[PDB]
């Protein structure tokens, strides 16, 4: 017996991967954010959050 109340589908299920690439034009999905472009390593300092 499933159900979809007001709040989310939490229980939900598994999302998978693929491979990085880097230095090549690649279509793009990164945990939700989609795009297209060369993805080289950076030099930024994102806060751990």
């Amino acid at each position: 017996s499933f159900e979809l109340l007001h709040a989310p589908a939490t229980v939900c299920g598994p999302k998978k991967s693929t491979n990085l690439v880097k230095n090549k034009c690649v279509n793009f999905n990164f945990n939700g954010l989609t795009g297209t472009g060369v993805l080289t390593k950076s030099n930024k300092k994102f806060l751990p959050f």
């Binding site: 109340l5 007001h6 709040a7 989310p8 806060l47 959050f49």
Partner: peptide
């Protein structure tokens, strides 16, 4: 100035319309 970094997100669904502490206690 000191900003407040996130610490959780409890994905509950209760409707809160009151509150209280359980024992200095400044509240805004």
């Amino acid at each position: 100035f000191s900003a407040l970094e996130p610490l959780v997100d409890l994905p509950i669904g209760i409707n809160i319309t009151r509150f209280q502490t359980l024992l200095d206690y400044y509240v805004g």
